[PDB]
Amino acid sequence: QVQLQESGGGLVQPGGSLRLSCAASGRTISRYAMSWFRQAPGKEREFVAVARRSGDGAFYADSVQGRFTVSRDDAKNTVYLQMNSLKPEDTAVYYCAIDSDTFYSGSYDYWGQGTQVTVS
Amino acid sequence: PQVRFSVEQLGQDGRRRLTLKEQPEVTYRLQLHMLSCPCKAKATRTLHLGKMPYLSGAAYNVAVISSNPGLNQTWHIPADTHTEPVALNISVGTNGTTMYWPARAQSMTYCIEWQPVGQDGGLATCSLTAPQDPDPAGMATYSWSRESGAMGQEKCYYITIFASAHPEKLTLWSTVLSTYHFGGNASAAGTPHHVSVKNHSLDSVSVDWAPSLLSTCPGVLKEYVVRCRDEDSKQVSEHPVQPTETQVTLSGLRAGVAYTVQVRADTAWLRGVWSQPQRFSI
Amino acid sequence: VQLVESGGGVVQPGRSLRLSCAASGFTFTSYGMSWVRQAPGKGLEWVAGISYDASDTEYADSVKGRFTISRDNSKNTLYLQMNSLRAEDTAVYYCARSPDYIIDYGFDYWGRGTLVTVSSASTKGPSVFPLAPSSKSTSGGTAALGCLVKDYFPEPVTVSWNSGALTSGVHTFPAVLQSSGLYSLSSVVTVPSSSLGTQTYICNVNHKPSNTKVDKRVEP
Amino acid sequence: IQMTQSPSSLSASVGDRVTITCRASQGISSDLAWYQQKPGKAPKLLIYDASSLQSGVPSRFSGSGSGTDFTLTISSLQPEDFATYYCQQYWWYPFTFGQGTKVEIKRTVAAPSVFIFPPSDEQLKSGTASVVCLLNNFYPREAKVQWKVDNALQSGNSQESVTEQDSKDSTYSLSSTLTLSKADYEKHKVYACEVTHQGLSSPVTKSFNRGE
Numbered sequence: 001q002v003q004l005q006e007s008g009g010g011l012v013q014p015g016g017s018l019r020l021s022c023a024a025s026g027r028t029i030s031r032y033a034m035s036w037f038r039q040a041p042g043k044e045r046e047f048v049a050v051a052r053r054s055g056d057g058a059f060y061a062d063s064v065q066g067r068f069t070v071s072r073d074d075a076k077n078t079v080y081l082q083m084n085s086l087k088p089e090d091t092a093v094y095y096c097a098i099d100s101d102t103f104y105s106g107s108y109d110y111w112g113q114g115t116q117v118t119v120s
Numbered sequence: 121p122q123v124r125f126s127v128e129q130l131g132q133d134g135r136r137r138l139t140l141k142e143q144p145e146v147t148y149r150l151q152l153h154m155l156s157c158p159c160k161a162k163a164t165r166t167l168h169l170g171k172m173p174y175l176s177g178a179a180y181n182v183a184v185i186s187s188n189p190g191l192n193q194t195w196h197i198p199a200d201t202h203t204e205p206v207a208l209n210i211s212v213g214t215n216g217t218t219m220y221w222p223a224r225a226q227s228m229t230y231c232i233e234w235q236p237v238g239q240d241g242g243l244a245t246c247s248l249t250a251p252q253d254p255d256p257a258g259m260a261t262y263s264w265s266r267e268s269g270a271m272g273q274e275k276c277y278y279i280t281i282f283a284s285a286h287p288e289k290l291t292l293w294s295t296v297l298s299t300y301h302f303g304g305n306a307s308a309a310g311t312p313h314h315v316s317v318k319n320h321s322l323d324s325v326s327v328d329w330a331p332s333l334l335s336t337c338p339g340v341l342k343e344y345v346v347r348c349r350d351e352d353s354k355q356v357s358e359h360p361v362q363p364t365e366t367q368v369t370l371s372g373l374r375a376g377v378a379y380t381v382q383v384r385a386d387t388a389w390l391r392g393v394w395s396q397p398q399r400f401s402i
Numbered sequence: 403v404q405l406v407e408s409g410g411g412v413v414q415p416g417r418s419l420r421l422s423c424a425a426s427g428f429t430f431t432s433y434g435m436s437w438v439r440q441a442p443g444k445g446l447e448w449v450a451g452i453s454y455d456a457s458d459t460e461y462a463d464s465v466k467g468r469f470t471i472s473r474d475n476s477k478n479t480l481y482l483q484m485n486s487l488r489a490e491d492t493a494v495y496y497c498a499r500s501p502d503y504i505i506d507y508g509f510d511y512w513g514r515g516t517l518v519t520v521s522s523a524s525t526k527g528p529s530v531f532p533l534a535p536s537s538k539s540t541s542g543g544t545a546a547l548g549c550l551v552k553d554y555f556p557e558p559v560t561v562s563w564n565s566g567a568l569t570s571g572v573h574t575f576p577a578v579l580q581s582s583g584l585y586s587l588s589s590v591v592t593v594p595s596s597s598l599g600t601q602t603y604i605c606n607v608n609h610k611p612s613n614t615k616v617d618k619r620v621e622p
Numbered sequence: 623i624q625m626t627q628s629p630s631s632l633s634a635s636v637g638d639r640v641t642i643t644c645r646a647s648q649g650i651s652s653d654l655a656w657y658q659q660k661p662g663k664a665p666k667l668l669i670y671d672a673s674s675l676q677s678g679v680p681s682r683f684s685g686s687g688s689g690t691d692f693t694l695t696i697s698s699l700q701p702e703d704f705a706t707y708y709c710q711q712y713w714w715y716p717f718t719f720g721q722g723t724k725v726e727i728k729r730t731v732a733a734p735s736v737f738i739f740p741p742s743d744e745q746l747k748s749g750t751a752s753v754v755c756l757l758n759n760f761y762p763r764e765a766k767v768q769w770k771v772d773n774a775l776q777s778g779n780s781q782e783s784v785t786e787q788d789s790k791d792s793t794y795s796l797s798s799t800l801t802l803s804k805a806d807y808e809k810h811k812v813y814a815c816e817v818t819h820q821g822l823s824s825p826v827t828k829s830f831n832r833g834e
Contacts, residue, residue: 037823045823047731057633059762059820062730099820104764106820135503147649162671166651168714174503187649225429285501288674292502436717446657446665446708448717462716496664507712508655510676512664531742533754546737546756550745550799573758573795575783580801587783588797590756592735 002027002110004096009115012086016119020081022096022112030054030074033099035108036081038092038117045095051079052104063089086119093117123148123169123184123193130200134283134295135174138182138197147187154290155179156199157231157282159246165290176282177201177295201280201298207339207388208279210271210301217270218263221281221296223254229287230260230296237276237300237337245270248287271303276337302337302387310334310385311393312344312366317381317400324371325400331366332385332392342386346370347394351378375402403427403511405497410516412525412556413487423480423497423513430478434458434500436509437471437482439493439518443576449495450482451505458505464490487520494518519556523583527614528554530607533588537622539595547620548573548590549605553582554612561589562606598622623648623711627720633728633762640696642707642723649689650713656685656694657708659722661786665708669694699725726763729792733821734760738814738828741807751807755815755828757796759788762820767798770814770829776800807832 008020022034033056036048049060051070058070069082079096093114101107121144128136150167154160156178167173169184175197183194209220219232232247249262264270271277281296302310312329320326327346334341344361346368361368373379378401384392409421423435436451450461450471459471470483480497494517498509533548551559561574574589589605607616624647634640644654652672657665667676669685672692682697696703704727709720734757741751755767763784769776779802785795798815814829 033820035820047733047821047823050731050820056629057728059633059728059731061821065730101764101766101818104762104820105766106764106818106822107766108823149651162674165671167653170714171504171506173506288671289501289507291506445722446659446710446719448710448719451715451717460715505715507653508657508667508670508676508710509665510667512666515664529745529748531745531752533739534742541735541737544735546735546758548739548756550742550752550754552745552752573785573797575785575795575797578781578783578799580781586799588754588799590758590795590797592758 002029002098004098004110004112006094006096006112006115009094009117011118014087014119016086017082017084018086018117020083020094020096020115020117022079022081024077024098029077029079029098030072031102033104034070034072034079035097035099035106036068036070037095037097038090039095039114040089040092048094049081050099056104083117086117088120091117091119125182125195125197127175127197127200130177130202130295133174134176134202136177136200137172137174138180139172140169145188147190149185149187151183151185152290153181153183154293155181156280157233157246157248157293158244159248160231160287162288162290167291173291175291176293177298178280178282178293199280202295203339204297204299205339207342208297208299208301209389211389212271212303212305214266216264216266216268217272218261220259220261223252223258223260224283224296225285226253227251228253228260228283228285230262231282231284231287232262232279233281234271234277234279234301236273237278239275243269271301274304274306274309274333275302276340277301277303300338300340302334302340306334306340306387307390308393310341310387312383312385312395315381315383315395315398317398319402320369321371322402323373324369325373325402326367326369327381327383328367329383329395334385334387334392335363340387342388344368345384345386345392347382347384349380350374351380373402377401403499405499405511405513407495407497407513407516410495410518412519412521414522415488415520416486418483418485419487419518421482421484421495421516421518423482425478425480425499428499431455431475432503434502434505435471435473435480436498436500436505437480437495438498438509439491439495440515441490441493444493447493451500452480453505454503460505484518487518489520492518492520517557521555521583523555525612526553526555526584527609527612528552528559528586528607528616530605530616530618532618532620533590534620535595535598535622541595543595544592545595545598546590546592547603548588549607549618549620550586550588551607552586553580553584554586554609555584556611557585559585559587560608563589563591564602564604565606568603623650623714623718625709625711625718625720627707627709627723629723630721631724631726631763633726634699635728636699636701638699640699640703640725642694642709642725644687644692644694644709644720646690646692646711648713650711652688653711653713654685654687654692655710655712657710658703658705659708660705668707726787727792729761731821732759732761732791732793734758734765734796734817734819734826736815736817736826736828738830740813740830740832746804746807749804751802751804753800753802753807753813755798755800755817757798757817757819759791759793759795760819760821761793763794765796765817765819767796767818768816769798769800770812770816770827772810772812773814774810 035050039045049070097108179199180197314330382394437449499511571592656669659665
């Protein structure tokens with residue numbers, strides 16, 4: 001079916017910036033919302049941002065509003081998370097997910113394997 | 121199929137309904153172009169054939185469009201014009217020109233259009249007013265600077281005024297009135313020429329004059345007035361004369377007495393200048 | 403310019419009802435008029451229209467043989483005679499003005515609107531049941547509670563909490579039409595879980611069509 | 623003539639540039655109008671003749687288009703502009719509206735606080751049982767609860783209701799009511815309410831056991 005592969009993480013100092021990529025293969029994803037999630041050690045996975053279809057906008061968690069920006073490169077079947085002004089609290093494994101419901105109800109059936117981001 | 125239009129006569133509201141009749145999926149449509157008042161912003165609208173708008177007395181180009189391809193035919197709707205027997209208070213003066221016309225409802229936008237007669241064509245003038253309410257006398261007004269040749273030339277002008285509460289909607293225009301006006305200093309220009317006095321009897325004279333230039337402009341000339349002065353008793357008499365007549369008979373004259381006669385031509389709003397005085401005796 | 407509708411209420415299916423719109427502030431005889439209805443949770447639907455001189459009348463397909471539009475230019479009143487009413491006709495009915503002699507262009511003036519409910523359900527007050535919070539907090543320091551207002555007719559009912567003294571965190575949902583023909587809704591509030599034992603929560607339901615008032619205490 | 627608007631709804635922030643489209647099944651030239659409606663109020667006319675601005679409407683509104691495709695545009699969204707918007711043809715009778723487009727205020731995603739409520743003992747006397755699931759303070763509006771009674775998936779027996787955007791935090795709340803007879807309710811033990819939302823990292827399930 002479809003496989004998601006995150007990349008672009010790694011170690012970064014406080015105040016620094018990183019851009020995560022989420023590349024989809026197997027199936028075209030330009031019709032689906034793509035969401036970013038994160039999970040810190042010993043915590044619950046939490047929502048970061050969602051890029052709906054081109055024209056339907058983007059929505060953000062309050063912890064990242066004004067600092068992270070989601071975008072799409074639909075020709076390359078890829079979506080991005082530009083992360084500016086990184087803080088220690090942002091350290092986590094970051095996951096991207098397809099919303100399999102085109103009506104945007106949040107049916108996250110397919111997930112990437114994640115990429116570590118460490119701020120400090 | 122084949123379709124032919126019909127039009128009502130202009131009603132008291134300044135409207136007339138354009139109706140339609142058929143005498144020969146398919147789509148039939150109507151394109152409507154208002155020719156009069158060219159200085160308006162919106163001049164055309166495409167309509168469904170079945171809705172039959174109430175046009176004004178303006179001139180229109182109407183054309184039928186059919187969609188399926190299609191065919192297109194056009195009829196030029198003539199501008200039927202109401203005649204207002206009462207002349208408008210149009211004043212041409214040193215500082216400009218001013219008009220007054222009967223207003224209707226509030227917040228009305230008016231279009232004033234005039235063109236000189238018998239240079240039939242030519243200087244077609246158009247004016248669009250801001251929305252305005254009636255004055256306490258029920259009149260709307262507009263003015264032009266002296267530089268604006270608004271009827272500044274001593275010629276006969278044909279004027280048409282339109283009204284709409286929504287000037288951006290083409291099918292909501294109505295006719296207010298149409299009228300004729302002789303511009304410039306009409307009082308002086310209207311003076312009759314070739315005034316002559318001829319012996320008609322032992323106690324009467326015939327007075328003849330050439331028609332005033334105002335008589336060529338429809339409805340402008342109200343009447344002629346003939347003033348006769350008895351130079352002995354200093355008595356003076358005025359005789360109104362129908363605008364279709366350029367002759368009058370003065371009777372009851374006394375022998376040996378000198379008399380003076382002058383003629384003037386009056387409009388509904390202006391006293392004409394008297395002709396050169398004629399001296400005569402029996 | 404004002405437009406005022408009247409004549410609405412409850413009407414049984416198949417019966418008849420006559421709506422009236424009173425116009426003021428302009429020359430009524432110079433403008434076409436129309437009726438537009440809106441079902442509660444639905445969009446707008448144009449119903450009928452009439453010209454300034456009542457020579458032109460048009461109706462939507464869903465109402466053609468059943469409704470009749472008419473105007474009294476001497477009394478500045480617009481009428482809509484409704485016959486053989488169905489349940490789908492249940493809507494708020496607005497009267498609106500057209501800017502020209504003929505039925506044309508948009509609608510620049512609207513009335514307040516009147517509600518017309520087509521049903522054979524007969525007037526009835528509601529039953530009030532408690533939506534009790536769990537006696538053991540499983541949502542941390544926040545808890546949710548409310549009241550269930552079921553089986554009433556017609557609309558509407560009013561709900562307050564602690565005689566209006568409790569407003570923070572209050573949610574009152576729009577009514578739903580059950581298969582029985584009766585309405586039902588719910589009102590909920592979120593409160594601190596530690597206050598369940600010390601604070602009392604009472605919802606106040608009122609149904610003026612049946613003159614029924616109910617006060618229900620909600621306990622874990 | 624059918625009038626189709628797109629999209630059905632959209633979220634925006636104050637200052638954004640908003641564009642709504644309206645599509646007609648047949649060619650209507652320029653006989654098109656636009657309306658704005660706020661909850662519980664009569665519509666207000668904004669634009670006629672596809673591009674003529676109605677008196678009193680701010681200049682940030684503008685329309686364009688002809689034939690079958692028409693666009694309404696707000697240059698800079700203001701707080702009093704959040705409402706629903708309808709297009710209408712008057713090219714021919716019967717006059718028809720579009721289905722409407724609701725312009726909502728965008729905010730940060732909020733996950734719903736899910737709660738489930740068993741039927742009261744007082745209601746069980748009447749022979750009926752109403753089970754209620756509550757999804758409180760969530761954003762955006764798109765979500766999906768499925769009822770599971772002893773893990774059997776339910777349907778046809780549930781109705782739903784949604785509030786408007788809260789005046790304080792612009793979130794939504796949703797209530798789903800499952801209606802059963804007392805006999806059917808006593809026939810089963812586990813009653814579960816399963817929520818999916820874009821802000822939920824997992825499908826959230828709240829359940830209870832009858833008799834506890």
